């Protein structure tokens, strides 16, 4: 539920982590 918006809005930002 919290990860959903994390990969959507914060997705492009996670590029550093989810790289």
Curated annotation (Swiss-Prot):
Result, substituting residue 9 to D: In strain: Isolate GD01, Isolate GZ50, Isolate GD03 and Isolate SZ3
Shown segment, full-protein numbering: 770 to 788 of 1255
UniProt lineage: Viruses, Riboviria, Orthornavirae, Pisuviricota, Pisoniviricetes
Glycosylation sites: 14
Superkingdom of this protein's organism: Viruses
Name of the protein this chain belongs to: Spike protein S2
Job of this protein: Mediates fusion of the virion and cellular membranes by acting as a class I viral fusion protein. Under the current model, the protein has at least three conformational states: pre-fusion native state, pre-hairpin intermediate state, and post-fusion hairpin state. During viral and target cell membrane fusion, the coiled coil regions (heptad repeats) assume a trimer-of-hairpins structure, positioning the fusion peptide in close proximity to the C-terminal region of the ectodomain.
Gene: S
